[PDB]
Nucleic acid binder design. Structure first.
Ligand SMILES: [Mg+2]
Ligand SMILES: [Mg+2]
Ligand SMILES: [Mg+2]
Ligand SMILES: [Mg+2]
Ligand SMILES: [Mg+2]
Ligand SMILES: [Mg+2]
Ligand SMILES: [Mg+2]
Ligand SMILES: [Mg+2]
Ligand SMILES: [Mg+2]
Ligand SMILES: [Mg+2]
Ligand SMILES: [N+]
Ligand SMILES: [N+]
Length: 387
RNA sequence: UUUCUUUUG
RNA sequence: GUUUGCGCGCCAUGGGCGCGCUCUAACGGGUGUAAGUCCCGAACAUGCCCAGGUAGUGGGAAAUGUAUAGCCGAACAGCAAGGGUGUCUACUGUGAGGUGGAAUCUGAAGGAAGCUGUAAGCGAAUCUCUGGUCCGACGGACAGAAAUCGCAUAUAAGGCUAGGCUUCGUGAUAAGCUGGCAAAGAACAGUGAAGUCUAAUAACUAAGCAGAGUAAAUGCGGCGGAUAUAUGGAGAGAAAGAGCGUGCACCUUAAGCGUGGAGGUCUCACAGAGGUUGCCUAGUAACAACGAACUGUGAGAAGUCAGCCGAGCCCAUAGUAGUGAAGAAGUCUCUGUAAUGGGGAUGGAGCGAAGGGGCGAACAAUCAUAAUGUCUCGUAUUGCAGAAAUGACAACAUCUGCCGUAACCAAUCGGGUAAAAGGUGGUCAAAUCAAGCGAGACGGAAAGGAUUGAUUGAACCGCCGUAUACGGAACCGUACGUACGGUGGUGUGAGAGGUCGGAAUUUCUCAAUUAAGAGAAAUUCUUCCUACUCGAU
């Protein structure tokens, strides 16, 4: 009923295109992703018969390419009907769902009143889970033992099958969230339960830790299991705050997200990096493009102004280290529009690099407009047009 | 905001 | 491929060693046998304070200058022999080229042992104590080595910049430290260790704390050593210092003087070897390849001269220049280092170059040369859903944030957060039966066995010892400064030309005028070669 839908030729061509677009690692064989076409040309119908007769041993550990490919086939066939039993407020590893929808929904709930955060960390997912409960959970909606057999062989030994299986296993948690009547948002394994009282939140946390320990068979540790306000919650990289104009909560990038971004910006604009500065500007604009495109729902305007100023100052000392010789430095300064005596005065302070690049003549020698034409996207324009 | 020289990836 | 960078010889204006002569503390005194040393005295100018912000007067506490014989000479200025150019012009050569002019750059950290004048700086045996700096390699500080100890150090020690907050509100001398960091110096600015010295007079018109920012990596402490940028001081010290002149079979020196330049490259003239209807012998950087454009003899010109795996042999100037009897090679013998060495005695003549190529030992890297247990048929079962004949009972799952309070609430007032008041589901055990996938045991049919050779090492970063020179004592540099010895570290820059060697690609040939099956023409990538042009040291 389902096994030929697994081995539909169009489904395997979709799995083919997906795994060659993934460009994954080699696994344990050392087999390359560019040679799976041969692996289907001469060793394809053998694998089809082996799966249809249940003789395949998927090779464990480091995930190989053909294992990933048939895993993508099983994920592509189970992205249908088992999806419709999922609750609406599960937002990870699903089609047409991103983290921004989860953030907007959570913001709607806390702006509707429920503001006490129950954070539960279902840590270390696939080495604490009981196997046979997961198999009978699959079998609660499936009947073909071929699918059960292949996922059982895979479970003892990456692609999309492991996140799909996690979303299947924690779907009972969302079912219980609905039946208890609670407000919650779960991304993929870290769920936040959203209630409007403190004693209620402590009761919910102890009830759900006992419910997880007893019925669903997982384990929760004490390293990210707190109850706190949105003033102290980090969730998917988003911190939360409340506006002084007291009507709505708002979401912002968390401080550790900004610290990671600042580490990446400082490494990409390392002063002693022996590459062209246009290469640095391209890698930068890649990074602000992605990083704004993640946090584009958050109020971040002051953060972009400060980070943009920091980016421009870092590129100024990158330019100043690139020129590197004071005669070349004064030559470039008088080329860029500085009068000669002051240009040679600042160029014969070619060292003290932070001191020169922080203020003075080089802020107008290489300004906002020159670095804008040079190829850099200023943060505020991209944030305003994206939000 | 030192009207200076040299050395290095 | 970074102005110069090679060998040999001469020469001090460099340095020792003596011998004389003179001078040595503003200007003068004393003390003493003896003062260059020890002690004392006058004025002016500057710095600092008499402030409340500054100029100009009046005054004052330390300090410095005019002011020791003299030394040195800026990252100061001018001159400047010499060198270069791919810019132009003259001349001379048959030509490769040469020479003289202009114009410009250079005249350098290693010998015109460059010249002149400065700013600034320095300025006396020896001894005790002490501050600071530097050193005891390189190597993110392992390994490796002759090359300090312990600890810390990259999601970044430590330093530093601009702030913020909390405590709090005499100077001088001056090596050094820092000025947001690759390293080092100089200038300027701010601070400034150690001890000493002062702690006088009158007026006027800072320590901590958290952050944020910034790194081509070192930081802190001990121990040992050095310290003439005449290192900052302190205490002894009747102690030496400086200039000039002169000797010394004294010792040395990369841009000074003289003289050599092989090897390769290039020009010309004769002969041959060709092409052409007497003339051509090249060009494309060289290799290659087109092309007739190659070969010997002879005459010429420019010219060398950069450690990276290289002991050594070979080619040529060449056993020549040059040294050597004011004594070589060899031998013997005391020694020194990690290594290169240095004396003493015989002995009787030898010793002995330069650049560029080949060959290459050694070295490094790379490549080639008797179970157990799984596949596999049956047995006892067990891991996990669903179904409920039926029993045990009204206590259990689950959601809901509070009682009074100043007449009003977030402990904004006192106790508490499974805090009161509450809702919603009834809760647990199943007899037996039972989906689909497995998990090992229990058995037996079938397997199965725990030295040689080639290639590469292109280039580059350096440090250390001695000798020898400089910028700038130390440190950083001068091609690792150079020479000779020791040592680690990285890995094959872009173009262009050739190899179009090897692999793919387009088009033909064969197989069938069929493949990504073999061959050929072309295209692209790749291996290799080339300072030809750049790039790096
Ligand atoms: Mg250098
Ligand atoms: Mg003076
Ligand atoms: Mg050292
Ligand atoms: Mg080091
Ligand atoms: Mg730090
Ligand atoms: Mg002194
Ligand atoms: Mg000549
Ligand atoms: Mg070499
Ligand atoms: Mg050095
Ligand atoms: Mg160098
Ligand atoms: N040179
Ligand atoms: N070097």
């Amino acid at each position: 009923n389902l096994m030929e839908q697994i081995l539909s030729s169009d489904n395997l061509n979709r799995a083919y295109l997906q795994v060659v677009r993934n460009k994954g690692a080699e696994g344990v064989d050392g087999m390359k992703y560019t040679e799976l076409k041969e692996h289907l040309a001469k060793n394809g119908e053998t694998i089809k018969g082996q799966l249809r007769t249940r003789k395949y041993k998927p090779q464990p550990g480091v995930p190989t390419v053909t294992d990933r490919f048939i895993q993508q086939a099983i994920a592509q066939v189970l992205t249908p009907i088992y999806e419709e039993q999922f609750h609406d407020h599960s937002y990870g590893f699903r089609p047409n769902r991103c983290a921004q929808q989860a953030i907007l929904t959570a913001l709607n709930i806390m702006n509707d009143g429920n503001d006490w955060i129950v954070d539960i960390d279902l840590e270390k997912f696939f080495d604490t889970v009981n196997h046979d409960k997961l198999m009978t959970l699959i079998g609660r909606t499936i009947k073909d033992g071929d699918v059960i057999s292949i996922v059982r062989k895979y479970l003892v030994s990456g692609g999309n099958l492991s996140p799909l299986l996690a979303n299947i296993m924690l779907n009972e948690l969302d079912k219980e969230m609905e039946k208890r009547g609670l407000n919650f948002v779960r991304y993929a394994d870290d769920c936040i339960i959203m209630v409007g009282s403190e004693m209620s939140a402590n009761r919910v946390m102890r009830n759900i830790s006992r419910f997880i320990e007893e019925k669903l068979g997982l384990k929760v540790n004490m390293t990210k299991s707190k109850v706190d306000r949105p003033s102290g919650l980090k969730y998917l990289g988003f911190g939360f705050y409340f506006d002084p104009r007291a009507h709505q909560f708002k979401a912002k990038p968390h401080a550790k997200s900004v610290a990671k971004f600042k580490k990446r910006m400082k490494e990409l604009t390392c002063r002693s990096w022996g590459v062209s500065n246009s290469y640095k500007v391209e890698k930068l604009n890649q990074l602000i493009r992605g990083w704004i495109n993640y946090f584009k729902i958050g109020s971040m305007k002051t953060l972009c102004k400060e980070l943009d100023s920091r980016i421009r100052y870092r590129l100024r000392m990158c330019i100043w280290k690139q020129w590197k010789t004071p005669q070349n430095q004064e030559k470039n300064l008088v080329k860029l529009g500085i009068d000669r005596n002051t240009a040679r005065r600042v160029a014969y302070t070619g060292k003290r690099i932070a001191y020169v690049c922080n203020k003075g003549a080089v802020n107008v020698a290489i300004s906002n407009k020159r670095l804008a034409s040079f190829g850099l996207i200023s943060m505020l324009d991209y944030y305003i047009e994206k939000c």
